[PDB]
Amino acid sequence: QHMSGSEMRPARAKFDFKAQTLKELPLQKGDIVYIYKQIDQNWYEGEHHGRVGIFPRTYIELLPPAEKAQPKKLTPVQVLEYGEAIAKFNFNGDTQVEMSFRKGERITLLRQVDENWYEGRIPGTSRQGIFPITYVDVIKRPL
């Protein structure tokens, strides 16, 4: 609400730095530090090993780049699957709203118009149309 206290950023120590004063704290190559406040353009301040001090920004890397694609693991939720179906009988429509298919093509279930009618499309979205359920066979209902 106040809009103050920006979040710190993870910085990586490019090299090791020896503390010369109490304000300055020691840093070792590879040591990760968090910059909660920038002392100056040439000096940065952050926390390391539970300690706080200052060091030349030229010795650390502010939020280093990520070479990993970052798969973000996975989750059982936030998922979806399209339904599958196959025509039971050859079908030859004569209208744009009505598509055509043979007695062996796969169909993607989208939704049910009413009870005996539904909308579907061929994988890849090549064709789309409506037709009676009694003329198609379902393989897997949508979740």
Side-chain angles (χ1 to χ4, degrees):
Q1 37 271 33
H2 192 278
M3 194 179 73
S4 180
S6 297
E7 292 175 350
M8 42 271 183
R9 297 172 292 178
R12 180 173 177 172
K14 185 165 67 174
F15 284 111
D16 61 359
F17 169 67
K18 296 180 182 297
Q20 297 179 13
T21 63
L22 286 64
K23 290 180 181 297
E24 290 173 349
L25 277 281
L27 248 61
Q28 294 177 354
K29 182 176 181 179
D31 183 67
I32 306 304
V33 301
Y34 290 89
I35 313 305
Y36 76 92
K37 143 168 269 293
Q38 182 176 354
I39 291 270
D40 211 344
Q41 290 172 330
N42 200 35
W43 295 300
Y44 269 54
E45 157 163 34
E47 183 176 0
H48 100 289
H49 200 286
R51 289 177 181 276
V52 63
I54 70 181
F55 24 88
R57 199 257 291 277
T58 62
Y59 254 78
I60 59 170
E61 292 180 354
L62 181 61
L63 216 178
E67 293 176 349
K68 295 180 180 180
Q70 197 68 54
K72 296 181 178 62
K73 298 180 180 180
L74 38 61
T75 175
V77 237
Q78 297 179 359
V79 299
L80 53 131
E81 189 66 90
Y82 292 91
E84 294 178 353
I86 290 169
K88 293 189 292 190
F89 303 98
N90 302 117
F91 192 100
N92 290 338
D94 197 3
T95 61
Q96 186 63 56
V97 290
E98 300 293 340
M99 271 290 177
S100 63
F101 43 86
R102 250 180 63 257
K103 196 173 82 65
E105 282 59 43
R106 292 174 63 187
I107 298 170
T108 300
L109 302 177
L110 298 175
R111 61 181 179 277
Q112 177 171 288
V113 171
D114 168 70
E115 290 173 348
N116 290 339
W117 296 89
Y118 76 107
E119 183 175 358
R121 63 187 179 84
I122 300 173
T125 325
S126 65
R127 293 179 180 180
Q128 181 179 58
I130 58 172
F131 12 85
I133 296 172
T134 58
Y135 273 55
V136 308
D137 178 89
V138 315
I139 266 59
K140 284 177 181 297
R141 292 173 294 177
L143 57 113

